[PDB]
Amino acid sequence: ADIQTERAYQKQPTIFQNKKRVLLGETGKEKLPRYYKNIGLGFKTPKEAIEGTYIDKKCPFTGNVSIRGRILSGVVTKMKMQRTIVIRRDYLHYIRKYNRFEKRHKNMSVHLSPCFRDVQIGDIVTVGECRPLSKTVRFNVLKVTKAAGTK
């Protein structure tokens, strides 16, 4: 109902949901078994991913992606695209001649899974590298930590 919003049927490819059963087991509950995996590197699977019902092939926990490479951090700056946000990474570049530094920044478009909700602008996000998901997206959100002003 709410999940089915596209012209094509949204399904989890590795789950077979047409297994026939007796009439007694049909009355109990129509609860599809969820597919999820541990991504490794000490990151825990959010409870909303295990208990959720969303369909996302690019989700690091319930989708077909692999996390390998560099693990980076950023601050959420824009949330206006579908399932992907823009974060900003700030740093200092050293100039040898003057023995000083200058402030520089980069912008990253990263994929945000539906399992992460209540994400606001200005909170810290830990992302991991994966295969290119689109023209400009190469990283996926792995952890979200709130800002210092959380009450």
Binding site: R7, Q17, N18, K20
Partner: protein, 205 residues
Amino acid sequence: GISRDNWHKRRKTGGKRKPYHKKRKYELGRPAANTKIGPRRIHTVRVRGGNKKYRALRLDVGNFSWGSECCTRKTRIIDVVYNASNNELVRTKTLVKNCIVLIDSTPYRQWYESHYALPLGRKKGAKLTPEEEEILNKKRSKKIQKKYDERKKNAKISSLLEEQFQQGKLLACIASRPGQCGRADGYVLEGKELEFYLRKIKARK
């Protein structure tokens, strides 16, 4: 010719880039294989590394699987009814991956009647042929009849599939890419997905 490179695209900022090399062999592309329905016609393509790609231009049969019964059979393809990507593909009857098609039901009915020994797809008029009568009403011993009666406990099919069997055609979804491997393989639609696609087809009309 047809190139699928990345350096002809604008940058993320929006500015255009000047290329630094011309088109390369490994960046080539080829015209689409618009697979229709008809007598089999397949052309082979020599691809990178010396391998082959089977470019199916016309197909009429393929093996589809009834997942709930785990019954895979080779059946002819009749018509294309729905296509999620574009409706122009339905009008031209193009066979692509994930398209919804109509297939014959006879081999599945034969397997069902040979397994559970129950009527399926038959009209209420009860007209019969002696071959089917001896298929269903064969004389079996005590042990074999005991197995068949036990199998008759689980012999139950949803109303949608039964109606499709009465119509003589089933709805299936193609899972293989005909333009790459040269064959049209898939699975029989059933369950919530069947209801979703039935609703989509009805709303399209």
